[PDB]
Amino acid sequence: MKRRPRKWKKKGRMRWKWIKKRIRRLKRQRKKERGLI
Amino acid sequence: ARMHARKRGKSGSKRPPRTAPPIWVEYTVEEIENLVVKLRKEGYSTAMIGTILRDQYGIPSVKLFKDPDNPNRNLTITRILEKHGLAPEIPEDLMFLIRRAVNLRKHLEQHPKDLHSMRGLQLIESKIRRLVKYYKRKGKLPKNWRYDPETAKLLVR
Amino acid sequence: TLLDPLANALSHITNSERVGKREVYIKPASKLIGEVLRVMQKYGYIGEFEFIDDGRAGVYRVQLLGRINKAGAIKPRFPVKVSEFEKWEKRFLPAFEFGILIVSTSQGVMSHKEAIEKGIGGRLIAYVY
Amino acid sequence: PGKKAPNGEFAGRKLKLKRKKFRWSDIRYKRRVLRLKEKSDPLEGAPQARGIVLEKIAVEAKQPNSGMRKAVRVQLIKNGKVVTAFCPGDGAIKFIDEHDEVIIEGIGGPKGGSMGDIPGIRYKVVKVNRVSLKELVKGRKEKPRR
RNA sequence: GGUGGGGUAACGGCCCACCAAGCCGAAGAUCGGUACGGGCCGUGAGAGCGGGAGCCCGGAGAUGGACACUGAGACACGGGUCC
RNA sequence: ACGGCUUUUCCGGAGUGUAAAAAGCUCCGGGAAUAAGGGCUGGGCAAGGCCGGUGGCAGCCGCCGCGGUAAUACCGGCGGCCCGAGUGGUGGCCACUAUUAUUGGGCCUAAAGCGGCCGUAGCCGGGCCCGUAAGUCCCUGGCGAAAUCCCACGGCUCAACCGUGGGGCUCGCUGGGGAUACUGCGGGCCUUGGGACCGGGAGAGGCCGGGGGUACCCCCGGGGUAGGGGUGAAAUCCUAUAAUCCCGGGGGGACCGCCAGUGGCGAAGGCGCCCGGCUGGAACGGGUCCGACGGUGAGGGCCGAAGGCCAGGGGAGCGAACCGGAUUAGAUACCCGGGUAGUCCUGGCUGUAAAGGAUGCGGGCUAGGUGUCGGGCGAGCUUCGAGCUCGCCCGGUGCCGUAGGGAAGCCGUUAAGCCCGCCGCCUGGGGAGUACGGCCGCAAGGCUGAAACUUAAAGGAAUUGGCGGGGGAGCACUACAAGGGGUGGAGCGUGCGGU
RNA sequence: GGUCAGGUCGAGCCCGGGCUCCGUGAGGGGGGAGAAGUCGUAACAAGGUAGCCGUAGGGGAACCUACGGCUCGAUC
RNA sequence: UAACUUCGGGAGAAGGGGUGCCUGCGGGUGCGUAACCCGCAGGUCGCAGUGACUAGGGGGGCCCGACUGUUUAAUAAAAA
């Protein structure tokens, strides 16, 4: 993933590490749904 | 700075501004040429010949003497060797770099995990290729000359 | 590495003038640098300059009089005709006829004023004001 | 952290390539060249459009403001797309009935979008049955039947 | 690309027979998108950016295509044939 | 209001105009007779702090903002301000915008330097001498239609318009002559940049082999009885099959304590026991050697914390997942007792970090002062030490700081100053590092990478105050400590809430 | 000019395969606006267990834990 | 010559053109004008030239079992 250090700041937003984890889970779910595994 | 380490060392020679050989030099041009030939036959490189001449014989530099056979040139160790038919077949710096690259490859084939020495080898090959490019451009090497580690062993030997 | 001895000389002169030095050394020296220094001395921006041999390209010893506001090389060396000098004057000088644009011409190195007087163009190599 | 490059006399190709490459970061130039607005414009690049009123709605005013904003749903004759158009005027909504043809016209918001405290509305009604809504609201003209 | 011809008002792979593997390309080939080109027009102090319907010159088209006759000139907007 | 005056225009006529008409032009009759609207009125931005209506509704608002019963901001009336036969509204282009930056932008903390090196095309390149005129400059022929553009004069009343001359434009092409400073090309001569070599030294630079250091865990034997561990307090757990603890032995797997230091060596990631072998680089001292061999580098190559994956070994101590005990309203955690993968070796893959100096690399210049490491030189001590002290030169590594720079924090010869080069990256915040497509990978994942739509801010430095289950000084019987009497339990008086 | 044969240019129709798109499709996925809902309190002070990056595993949800790293860390 | 894919496959995917006889040349191996095989040009006949004989029809979804294999000799060969 591309680096956006501006998003690591916690002012009015949740942790970027857990956002990244959620996005990766979403990507895996979409790939599984599409059948690409 | 340095080619790869990018350090700014400044140690080197500081030759005074001169146009003629110093008056206290005992030997003449002919004896200087004979000494150069004798040292080359003994088996020293050009740098070692010049160092020995400066140290033991007290000759500051052969480049201070005008060439008797060419009014437009000054004397030089390589020029003396080439006029006596004793110049090296390939340039000495290239020979030294090839020799130590071959030695490093011999070490690395017994120590495959020495990645730092492998990087040193890569730097040596880069220097070799730079010199090969320069000598190819200047015509001091055949146009078909290429550097290959397998064939470099015979050149080293 | 070293690429522009003339630009190095002009930047060194500008820095020394800003810091208030009276004497500068230019190294390495060249005939283009000598011609430029001759033009500046003729126009009164620098004092006496002398060439010194050191077994190398040489050194130039120059005396400054505190009369230079800014001296700089022009890169790329733009070719300029006789009728195109006004835009370069506006680009490199504060007012009309204030400084001098040093131009290398086919008849030698001379200021843009003498180039206009002779009716010849050249290549802009420096500017001093 | 260095002198801006290229600066050489024979580097015009590299300079032009750099300028062309970095001109794509400009959103305005990229949108104009790729015709992105034309690809999604309901009005197809027109300054005004004609349509038929489908229904009348009211919109919340955005915070910190509060109030009803009367709008209509208009189906464009050009392509059948449905948009929402504001009805400027103190009693403009009274003069607009169902199945009435109207002339919608852009709203002068930032860029080309919405304005004021009504986001999501980009158009306003100007003419109703070929009669201007301003004159209808001010009472100088009487609405025809259509 | 060549060797020999045919055809054309003319030179030409334009076409044919034979002989070779050439030609183009990260300095943007091929493919895709858009677009008649220019003199010019709009704007800006200028560099520049944007447009290029009206007038002039040049190019194409006559519902979409393909063909021919006559004539110096057409495969022809107000001549011809077929789909 | 009164008294006058013309007629551009309007109305009616006569000529002239036109192929014929019309318009236009000249003249007569009548008469101020026929002729002003559009936006705006809170700032930006010129214009009212007046009145009447609505009252978070109706509405206005490009942006900031107004409206809640005293609205200069909504509607209306009366005033006014801008332009004016025009004046508003919407879409599009340029300027605004140095927010596309050749002129002429930025990348430490705000958007942005590839995690780091080697190197190919390209771009940029040290000094001198001779030769050619390709680039370059000057002069001179053939061109680049007209209209359009600028100026002067002349003709329609002046003007718009047109004519006569001068110039410009078509970003240029081409035939010749001249010049040689710079670039290009060919030749010659150099050593300053960069390489090669020699000498004495420095260093946790790397690989292999062999010896150790305590510590910790387990097993056996002897001693010795009742607890041990652990926490804020406990509990799970170990213990009578003899635990914790002490002593004599055996076995194993990680790691090299103090010394140790803004110390040292490496491109970076990283690298501390000792000895031997192999091996990379740098600094210093070099009247040594070659002679521009150089810098940066699109594509490409190599190295690359931890973690994860494949195959084979090992597994002491820690310890994701998991089990149990505590705390809590809940506690899928913080705390405690156990524990699989992993952490360790070998052959490979993955190529990711706040991989940070949030600062790419080469060169020249711009006050100093003060530590420390390596080398060299000079002087003085000496137990003659590879020892100590002081000064100077070079190369690394820190702090303070002048000129100057910056929004500031701060940087300041180890620049974030001025100059000469090269590559990479950024163009308001989200959507989004997402969707689609392509490449690599066993997989996890890696690289490339948008739109629709949404938003007026997001972001940085610094100031005053307020707060902290931050740190310090103080003060208080409406705070405590040490004490005296009470209220809260009952009836009643009185004042509240509720009914 | 008819008829029969070849030779060419060749419209139209049919079949198969590429490319540029355009419309829709029950149902799922996240995203953005919404105003005065429910659960807990993750970050800002040492935010009550310092925060954050990389990898990996768990949890209604913010989040929790392990290894390596930075200070964009308070006290000392 | 497609989706997909375990990268091996799917695949002879799908789909399109040709095929006789006669005359004469060229090529490969070969000492050979011995034998076998592979091309080229022209002429010509029929409705049809692998003319008889020999000799796949094909494609797209879904369920089950991975596959080759075995089974109720005498009603079940399958998903068992």
Side-chain angles (χ1 to χ4, degrees), chain A residues 1-36, chain B residues 1-156, chain C, chain D residues 1-3 5-145:
Chain A
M1 269 198 222
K2 276 172 179 47
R3 311 299 276 146
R4 271 202 195 138
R6 180 197 192 84
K7 294 226 168 186
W8 307 339
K9 300 169 173 182
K10 290 296 302 310
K11 187 187 195 279
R13 57 185 334 290
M14 89 183 267
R15 203 172 171 178
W16 158 249
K17 262 179 76 158
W18 316 141
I19 282 172
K20 198 198 201 109
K21 206 164 192 159
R22 257 145 57 122
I23 274 154
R24 282 179 167 150
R25 276 171 197 162
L26 253 72
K27 282 157 75 179
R28 260 191 75 67
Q29 183 198 357
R30 277 169 200 147
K31 279 198 243 212
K32 267 262 316 183
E33 154 149 305
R34 250 160 83 78
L36 277 35
Chain B
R2 294 279 84 75
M3 198 165 252
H4 306 306
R6 279 154 183 74
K7 279 232 150 32
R8 298 184 227 306
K10 303 269 187 248
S11 82
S13 281
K14 293 164 281 292
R15 50 174 266 286
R18 275 198 188 254
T19 66
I23 322 94
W24 41 263
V25 163
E26 322 218 89
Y27 305 97
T28 70
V29 183
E30 304 56 3
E31 295 134 302
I32 282 161
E33 292 203 1
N34 287 122
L35 285 165
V36 166
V37 165
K38 181 172 75 67
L39 290 172
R40 181 55 173 179
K41 289 186 185 296
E42 274 197 38
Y44 293 101
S45 62
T46 51
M48 272 315 282
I49 283 163
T51 304
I52 287 172
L53 285 176
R54 146 166 75 70
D55 285 5
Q56 195 186 327
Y57 299 93
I59 295 157
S61 182
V62 180
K63 286 149 76 77
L64 294 164
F65 290 82
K66 202 84 144 35
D67 190 6
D69 297 350
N70 199 322
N72 320 341
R73 286 185 336 162
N74 261 332
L75 261 190
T76 299
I77 301 290
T78 299
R79 283 170 189 162
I80 293 165
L81 294 186
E82 99 197 348
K83 81 169 69 173
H84 278 86
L86 288 174
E89 247 293 299
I90 73 162
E92 296 203 290
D93 47 354
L94 190 58
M95 200 51 269
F96 281 124
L97 284 177
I98 286 169
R99 282 186 117 86
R100 70 185 191 173
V102 164
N103 196 70
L104 189 43
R105 270 180 184 286
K106 169 192 298 123
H107 158 83
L108 279 171
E109 67 63 5
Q110 216 93 354
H111 297 263
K113 278 165 81 82
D114 209 349
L115 301 182
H116 294 62
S117 285
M118 195 202 60
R119 173 160 182 291
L121 178 73
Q122 291 170 356
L123 296 189
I124 296 155
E125 319 269 68
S126 290
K127 286 173 169 180
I128 285 162
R129 292 207 210 85
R130 286 172 173 254
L131 284 180
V132 161
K133 212 192 209 170
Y134 163 72
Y135 291 124
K136 285 262 282 296
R137 203 200 314 121
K138 287 294 176 174
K140 313 275 293 295
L141 282 176
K143 204 62 82 83
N144 72 295
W145 211 90
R146 231 183 72 83
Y147 170 70
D148 181 65
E150 277 328 321
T151 36
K153 300 180 188 192
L154 275 66
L155 278 156
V156 152
Chain C
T1 55
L2 168 64
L3 312 162
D4 227 306
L6 176 59
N8 276 7
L10 291 187
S11 63
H12 181 25
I13 281 162
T14 301
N15 288 338
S16 309
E17 268 263 17
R18 284 249 290 91
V19 86
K21 299 258 164 157
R22 309 303 299 169
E23 165 165 85
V24 295
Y25 288 88
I26 302 301
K27 144 164 118 182
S30 76
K31 281 179 152 66
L32 190 67
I33 289 161
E35 288 331 279
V36 166
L37 289 171
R38 187 211 80 227
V39 170
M40 317 165 57
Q41 185 201 47
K42 178 225 277 280
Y43 267 81
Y45 287 109
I46 60 164
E48 289 260 296
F49 68 98
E50 145 197 18
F51 182 84
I52 311 171
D53 175 352
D54 56 347
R56 290 153 184 83
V59 189
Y60 261 127
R61 200 257 290 310
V62 184
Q63 314 274 322
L64 303 167
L65 312 165
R67 311 233 56 74
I68 292 167
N69 305 268
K70 205 201 281 233
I74 294 168
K75 276 298 232 58
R77 286 162 177 183
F78 293 101
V80 59
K81 302 188 195 302
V82 289
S83 60
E84 313 188 341
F85 274 118
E86 172 131 341
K87 74 170 210 95
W88 298 109
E89 274 203 335
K90 288 182 182 236
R91 167 105 73 96
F92 283 111
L93 304 179
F96 73 95
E97 280 160 17
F98 195 93
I100 49 165
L101 303 165
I102 310 184
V103 194
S104 190
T105 71
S106 193
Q107 304 195 36
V109 171
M110 70 205 52
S111 80
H112 79 289
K113 300 173 180 187
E114 333 187 332
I116 291 165
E117 265 155 56
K118 265 167 192 133
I120 55 177
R123 299 215 158 209
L124 300 166
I125 59 164
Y127 83 84
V128 181
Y129 76 89
Chain D
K3 217 216 155 171
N7 198 240
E9 185 161 14
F10 309 109
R13 187 192 304 284
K14 185 66 172 63
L15 203 52
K16 193 159 123 220
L17 253 75
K18 182 180 86 168
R19 176 55 48 222
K20 183 177 80 174
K21 171 192 187 168
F22 284 127
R23 213 190 171 186
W24 280 113
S25 298
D26 190 3
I27 186 66
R28 285 200 330 134
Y29 163 83
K30 165 160 167 178
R31 291 246 304 172
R32 163 171 72 73
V33 166
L34 298 185
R35 312 189 101 240
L36 295 186
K37 189 192 180 187
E38 281 95 353
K39 221 144 289 195
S40 304
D41 198 357
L43 302 204
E44 314 232 53
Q48 302 177 346
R50 195 180 259 120
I52 309 295
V53 172
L54 293 183
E55 58 152 314
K56 306 154 62 160
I57 57 172
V59 191
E60 208 29 54
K62 232 206 307 193
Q63 294 318 111
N65 300 2
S66 96
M68 281 309 69
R69 313 269 178 244
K70 275 77 181 174
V72 290
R73 300 208 61 72
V74 173
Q75 180 153 54
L76 304 178
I77 294 158
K78 270 197 179 205
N79 42 7
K81 306 257 199 63
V82 191
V83 299
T84 189
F86 183 55
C87 303
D90 207 38
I93 197 63
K94 155 174 64 103
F95 289 101
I96 302 192
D97 276 322
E98 280 267 56
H99 298 319
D100 272 20
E101 67 143 353
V102 290
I103 295 280
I104 64 152
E105 196 217 76
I107 214 155
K111 294 169 182 182
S114 45
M115 83 94 198
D117 58 355
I118 30 171
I121 302 175
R122 308 159 152 155
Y123 314 103
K124 58 177 174 173
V125 176
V126 178
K127 304 184 79 172
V128 174
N129 293 350
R130 290 113 36 210
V131 167
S132 73
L133 187 52
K134 277 205 46 48
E135 292 257 272
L136 280 174
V137 165
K138 272 164 174 42
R140 301 204 264 283
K141 277 194 173 70
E142 316 322 342
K143 175 180 154 146
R145 295 182 62 81

